[PDB]
């Protein structure tokens, strides 16, 4: 149903080693479509998907221009933040910025975001109403005032409710084959001895899209979330994702247990059971 666009920007200073590293990437839902990476040869924004490569030559020039600007802005930011926190010249530091927007099934604006971090911690962010800031501390209250005076909120609200959404809706229709279709899990269950009197039952979800999935274990149709082991959802490297959930059990009890998958692509939920 819903969809989203997100741009992610990172800069890192290299205090005795020259210009800051800078990397930007943007995604629609879970599919990456572009990158820029200061330290690569071309110095252009590059395509990272097949459906975006069709875009006109003025797409790349502008995107390139704009992103080098974000870059020179993050570059100045690194110097100001060192100033504000009185940190030495000696150390390496990090800014990250994230923005974008979500839509519904009707493809209409739903929400937008703009969040900024220094050294991996909330610095300033834009609230849900789109009109005000949440400032993390006193250094950042200084920034909040500078952005209240330059009307940054209104300026981003106008990108978010306008340009972000229109161009998302666009990409959806152009990459519809890869962005609107939703791969259901190939599920499977393994069994291993871990000693004389115990056994591991691993529940596997493979080859699915999007990333949102839920795996749970039940003993006689009753949840039990401790004695489980669940790995972070991980990309397969070819568009799809993978995940597993395990549970250690007493030897001989394997059919007490059931695995439950929930995914967008599945209509009913799935139930698995050690049989093979």
């Amino acid at each position: 149903g819903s969809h989203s666009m997100r741009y992610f920007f990172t800069s890192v200073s290299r205090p005795g080693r020259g210009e800051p590293r800078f990397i930007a990437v943007g995604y629609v839902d879970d599919t990456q479509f572009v990158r820029f990476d200061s330290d690569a040869a071309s110095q252009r924004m590059e395509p990272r998907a097949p459906w975006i490569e069709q875009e006109g030559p003025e797409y790349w020039d502008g995107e390139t221009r704009k992103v080098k600007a974000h870059s020179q802005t993050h570059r100045v930011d690194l110097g100001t933040l060192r100033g504000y926190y009185n940190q030495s010249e000696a150390g390496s530091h990090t800014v990250q910025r994230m923005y974008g927007c979500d839509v519904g099934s009707d493809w209409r604006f739903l929400r937008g975001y703009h969040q900024y971090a220094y050294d991996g911690k909330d610095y300033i962010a834009l609230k849900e109403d789109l009109r005000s800031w949440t400032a993390a501390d006193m250094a950042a209250q200084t920034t909040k005032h500078k952005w209240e005076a330059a009307h940054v909120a209104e300026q981003l609200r106008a990108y978010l409710e306008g340009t972000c959404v229109e161009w998302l809706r666009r990409y959806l229709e152009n990459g519809k084959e890869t962005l609107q279709r939703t791969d259901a899990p190939k599920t499977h269950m393994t069994h291993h001895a871990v000693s004389d009197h115990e056994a591991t039952l691993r529940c596997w979800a493979l080859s699915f899209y999007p990333a949102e999935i839920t795996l749970t274990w039940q003993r006689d149709g009753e949840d039990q979330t401790q004695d489980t082991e669940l790995v972070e959802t991980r990309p397969a490297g070819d568009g799809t994702f993978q995940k597993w959930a395990a549970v250690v059990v007493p030897s001989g009890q394997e059919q007490r247990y059931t695995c439950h998958v929930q995914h967008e692509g599945l209509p009913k939920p799935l139930t698995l059971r050690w049989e093979p």
Binding site: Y7, K66, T73, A158, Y159
Partner: peptide, 10 residues
Amino acid sequence: MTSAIGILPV
């Protein structure tokens, strides 16, 4: 696409 507006220094 990225934003031409409201990306100001801190």
